[PDB]
Amino acid sequence: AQALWTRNKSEITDEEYKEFYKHIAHDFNDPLTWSHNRVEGKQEYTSLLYIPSQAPWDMWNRDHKHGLKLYVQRVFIMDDAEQFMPNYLRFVRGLIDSSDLPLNVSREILQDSTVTRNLRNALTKRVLQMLEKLAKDDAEKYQTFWQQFGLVLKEGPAEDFANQEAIAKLLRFASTHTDSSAQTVSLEDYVSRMKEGQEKIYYITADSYAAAKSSPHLELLRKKGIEVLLLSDRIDEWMMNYLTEFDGKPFQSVSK
Numbered sequence: 001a002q003a004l005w006t007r008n009k010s011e012i013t014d015e016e017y018k019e020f021y022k023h024i025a026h027d028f029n030d031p032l033t034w035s036h037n038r039v040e041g042k043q044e045y046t047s048l049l050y051i052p053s054q055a056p057w058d059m060w061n062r063d064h065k066h067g068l069k070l071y072v073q074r075v076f077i078m079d080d081a082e083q084f085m086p087n088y089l090r091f092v093r094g095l096i097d098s099s100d101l102p103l104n105v106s107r108e109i110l111q112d113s114t115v116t117r118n119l120r121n122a123l124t125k126r127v128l129q130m131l132e133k134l135a136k137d138d139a140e141k142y143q144t145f146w147q148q149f150g151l152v153l154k155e156g157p158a159e160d161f162a163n164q165e166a167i168a169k170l171l172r173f174a175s176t177h178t179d180s181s182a183q184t185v186s187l188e189d190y191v192s193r194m195k196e197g198q199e200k201i202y203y204i205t206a207d208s209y210a211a212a213k214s215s216p217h218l219e220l221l222r223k224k225g226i227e228v229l230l231l232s233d234r235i236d237e238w239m240m241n242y243l244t245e246f247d248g249k250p251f252q253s254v255s256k
Contacts, residue, residue, distance in 0.1 A: 003074065005048045005097060009036050021050045024069060025093040029053045032141045034094070035130045039122075043115070047123060049094035051130065053141075055148045059091065068123075069095035072103050083110045084120050088156040088167075089127050091149050096123065121162070128166040135170065135186075146172045146183060154235045157242040168246050174209060174230040176218065181209040185229065187246045195226060200252040203229040205237045217254045228254055 004012065004020045021031040031050040038046045049068075058064040067082035067090075074097060085092050100115050110116050135142045146153075156167040168187055175185045177193070190201055202221055206212035212230040221228050231240070244251055 005036065005046050005095060006074070009038075012036070020048075021052075021093065024095065025050065025052070027052060027054070027056070027093075031093075032145055033130055033134045033138075035126055037126065043119060043122070044099040045119070046097045047094065047126065049092055049123065049127060049130065051127075051134070051145060052091060052093060053144060053148070055091065059152070064090070066090045068093070070101075070105075071095065071097040072101050072105060073097075073099055075103060077101075077105055081110075083107075083116050084123050085127070086120070086124055086156070086159050088153055088159050089124060091152060092127055124160070124163060125166075128163055128170070131170050132166070143172075143184070150183065151233060151235060154233065154239050157239050164243070165246075168243060171243075173203075174212075174232070176213075176222070176228045176230065181213075181230075185227075190227060190229065191247050191249060193227065194249075195224070198226055200250050201229065201246060202226055202252050202254050203231055203240065204254045205231040205240065208232050215254070221254055 004016060017034050017036070018030045021034065022028060030053055032053050034048065034050045036046075036048045056064070056066075065080040067080045068084045069079050070077040070081040070084075081096075082090070084096055096119065098115075098119070100119075101113070102109070131145070134145060150172060153167070153170060157164055160167060171187060172183045173185045173187075173190075174181050174183050175190065177185065187201070204212050204215055204217060206215060209230060209232045212232050218228055231237075240251065240253075
């Protein structure tokens with residue numbers, strides 16, 4: 001029962017990582033991906049972070065116990081430590097074994113420490129890096145991710161200005177480009193087929209895909225041969241108050 005996270009990366013099999021996820025998360029589904037990292041110097045810790053393949057049962061309950069398992073110098077402090085992730089990444093499971101925090105660390109010390117805020121931001125970037133790698137390396141698994149967690153990730157644009165570019169690149173949308181309600185379109189995809197002279201990313205929000213797809217505000221862009229993102233989730237109108245540019249291109253509602 002050697003602590004998995006203390007072993008060398010190159011010496012841990014993929015099946016050991018998936019079994020360890022199931023072990024620490026009480027989940028019988030394999031994780032989609034993970035990141036195992038040892039950090040030294042300014043901050044010193046090991047992190048092992050997982051993306052589940054399925055949303056947890058209590059995810060939409062405010063009082064969902066979530067977060068990471070915290071260890072200090074191999075000594076267990078607490079589970080479900082929410083201080084290490086932003087709320088839009090509350091699905092991430094895993095552990096942090098820190099050498100910077102004191103053995104008597106408390107929730108009081110956690111919120112007062114500049115250590116925690118820096119650690120949370122570093123771990124955030126590690127998660128975004130992991131998801132970007134998944135999106136590139138395994139599209140089928142990324143689509144599963146998006147189906148399970150996209151609505152949570154859409155909280156990110158308002159919560160986290162620092163990573164807005166990275167976060168935006170993880171979003172997926174339906175669009176007019178092909179006649180399908182599948183949320184397969186990335187903003188990078190959209191930008192890569194922008195027409196000569198097109199300077200904005202066009203969208204419409206509606207209460208459903210059907211309502212979006214059949215809007216008369218689409219007729220004009222369909223004549224210019226311009227793609228329109230079809231946003232039909234409850235969170236979308238609100239998210240678009242924060243996601244106002246991408247790759248230097250402003251967003252524009254087709255209705256205004």
